[PDB]
């Protein structure tokens, strides 16, 4: 798709790049490019701040 910037509101893609426990997946495993990887990490963090994603696989 050649997205200009990964979107923190775009949850499904993020959900594909976080593991079951909520941790950010390494770039070795996901195969993401470094520029995108950084962008993705930032987006995930923002979502977590907005309770769109969870910080951890804990109770809720």
């Amino acid at each position: 798709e050649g997205v200009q910037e990964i979107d923190y509101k775009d949850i499904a893609t993020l959900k594909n790049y976080i593991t079951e426990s909520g941790k950010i997946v390494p770039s070795r495993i996901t195969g993401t490019r470094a520029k995108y990887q950084r962008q993705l990490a930032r987006a995930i963090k923002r979502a977590r701040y907005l309770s769109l994603l969870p910080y951890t696989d804990r109770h809720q």
Binding site: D7, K9, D10, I11, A12, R46, R48, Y49, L50, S51, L52, L53, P54, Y55, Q60
Partner: protein, 104 residues
């Protein structure tokens, strides 16, 4: 003028006041000649984790072109109003006048 992007989560018990709040914020921005490029009430939503022990916060998204002084005032309003649980105003270069992925 800096393109901003506001998202604020409101306490679900204050959900009946939410249309009015949106109107108020819009009115103030316009008053200060601020454009409003998209405005999406996402509605009631299940939190990924409980904030202040309460679930299902009412999310509003608002991409705006305004001056920073007015943005500051808006932020202050958010912080002091005991209805909006969280807020986040984050600068953007280009006004993303496009529908959000969850609405899309």
């Amino acid at each position: 003028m800096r393109h901003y992007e506001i998202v604020f989560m409101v306490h679900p018990d204050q959900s009946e006041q939410v249309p009015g709040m949106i109107e108020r914020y819009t009115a103030a921005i316009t008053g200060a000649e601020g454009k409003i490029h998209r405005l999406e009430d996402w509605g009631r939503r299940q939190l990924a984790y409980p904030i202040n022990k309460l679930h299902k916060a009412h999310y509003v998204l608002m991409n705006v072109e305004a001056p920073q002084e007015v943005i500051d005032e808006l932020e202050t309003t958010f912080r002091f109003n005991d209805a909006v649980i969280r807020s986040m105003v984050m600068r953007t270069k280009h006004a993303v006048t496009e529908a959000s992925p969850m609405v899309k």
